[PDB]
Design a binder for this molecule. Structure first.
Ligand SMILES: NC(=O)c1ccc[n+]([C@@H]2O[C@H](COP(=O)([O-])OP(=O)(O)OC[C@H]3O[C@@H](n4cnc5c(N)ncnc54)[C@H](O)[C@@H]3O)[C@@H](O)[C@H]2O)c1
Length: 399
């Protein structure tokens, strides 16, 4: 069967098994080139690391660099739907198969607990798994992006929204394939939707993960733990600062202080990373247009870093650096979005967005790069993969 992109309502349904595998392998070679001994030595290294949300995006790079850069044991946890012989799985199900295969070849320990990380059953599965192998955790990476969360105590399912407060946030959006420059808007969120997004996107659950692992004595002396976040440009402040994602973000970094205060033997940070193309982007205003214009500028300047290039820098120049310290900002946060929000980039992206219209879209913003990122998340448009070739089965990767 010829597997090619079936993208409906700007969301990609299928996934290319070999393309997912090559993706993880390309991210692996990069890690090996970037984390050399001139960078890895003179500083500590992670020995054992739990990665919550391991299967793609920032999760996958965090886990890749940890095992292939710093030769670490890794326990992943993600929510994936497996393949049949004939039924395509979620991109993550293939990415995790690809991660185990290449980590067996190099003789590293890796187990990926498949299932809902918000649940208690999963927390249990890793509690027993870390105990079964003995050694305890020195890096917990909270990297969960999910639109929904079943509460373990109440049992209520919580949807999340991406909306502003007070007045409608309206602005341009750009369909990356057609190049059509449209006009979508996010409408003010009420009070039921506001607390529901803090219930989901905040640090409510991340706190649970740390408390439970602490009473089980599964954390080392001075263990680093970090949750990912995003601040963004001055344009999307109405969603990311004073919006409903904004409030949820503020709860996450409030959890990072509450965690250092209640257990001084652990060190918690929220890492603010760069913006990149995800499943949310399409139906959220001025994010595709921003990101497409952003790649054009950052490619031109040579400070465009994708997922793996971002996280390798993080480990090497924030956590495990010669000096020992963890460089943070004013409100005690790791800053990796430092290149994105540097002003000569921001001023340039703003100029570019004002002079894009119904036809110059492909022409003066990087829609092609945006397409590649959006497709590569599903195993498509990866170089070195011939897509015309038939696909044997959907429940295994091979080569
Ligand atoms: N792209 C951005 O705007 C951006 C930038 C910086 C940081 N972040 C933050 O980074 C964090 C993770 O981002 P990402 O790039 O990994 O997104 P991603 O969608 O690529 O991956 C999310 C992870 O969650 C896992 N999964 C989804 N629901 C689950 C569940 N309920 N239980 C167990 N696994 C589940 C997926 O398998 C995946 O590994 C998010 O909290 C996000 O806020 C986003």
């Amino acid at each position: 069967m010829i597997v090619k992109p079936m993208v409906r309502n700007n969301i990609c349904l299928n996934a290319h098994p070999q393309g997912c595998k090559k993706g993880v392998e390309d991210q692996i070679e990069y890690t090996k080139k970037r984390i050399t001994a001139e960078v890895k030595a003179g500083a500590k290294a992670p020995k054992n690391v739990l990665v919550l949300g391991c299967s793609n995006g920032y999760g996958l790079a965090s886990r890749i660099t940890a095992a292939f850069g710093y030769g670490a044991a890794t326990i992943g946890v993600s929510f994936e739907k497996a393949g049949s012989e004939t039924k395509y799985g979620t991109p993550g199900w293939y990415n995790n198969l690809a991660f185990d295969e290449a980590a067996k070849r190099e003789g590293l320990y890796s187990v990926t607990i498949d299932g809902d990380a918000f649940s208690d059953e999963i927390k249990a599965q890793v509690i027993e798994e870390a105990k079964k192998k003995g050694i305890k955790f020195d890096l917990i990476v909270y990297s969960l992006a999910s639109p929904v969360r079943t509460d373990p105590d109440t049992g209520i399912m919580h949807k999340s929204v991406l909306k502003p407060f007070g007045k409608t946030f309206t602005g341009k959006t750009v369909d990356p394939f057609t190049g059509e420059l449209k006009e979508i808007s996010a409408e003010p969120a009420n009070d039921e939707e506001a607390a529901a997004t803090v219930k989901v996107m905040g640090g409510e659950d991340w706190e649970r993960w740390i408390k439970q692992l602490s009473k089980e004595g599964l954390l080392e002396e001075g263990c680093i733990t970090l949750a990912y976040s995003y601040i963004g440009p001055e344009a999307t402040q109405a969603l990311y600062r004073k919006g409903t994602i904004g409030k949820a973000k503020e709860h996450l970094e409030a959890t990072a202080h509450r965690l250092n205060k209640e257990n001084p033997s652990i060190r918690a940070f929220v890492s603010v990373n760069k913006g990149l193309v995800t499943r949310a982007s399409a139906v959220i205003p001025v994010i595709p247009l921003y990101l497409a214009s952003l790649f054009k500028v950052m490619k031109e300047k040579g400070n465009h870093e994708g997922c793996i290039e971002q996280i390798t820098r993080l480990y090497a120049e924030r956590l495990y650096r010669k000096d020992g310290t963890i460089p943070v900002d004013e409100e005690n946060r790791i800053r990796i979005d430092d290149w994105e929000l540097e002003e000569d980039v921001q001023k340039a992206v703003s100029a570019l967005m004002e002079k894009v219209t119904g036809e110059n879209a492909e022409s003066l913003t990087d829609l092609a790069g945006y397409r590649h990122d959006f497709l590569a998340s599903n195993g498509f448009d990866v170089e070195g993969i011939n897509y015309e070739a038939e696909v044997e089965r959907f429940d295994r990767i091979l080569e």
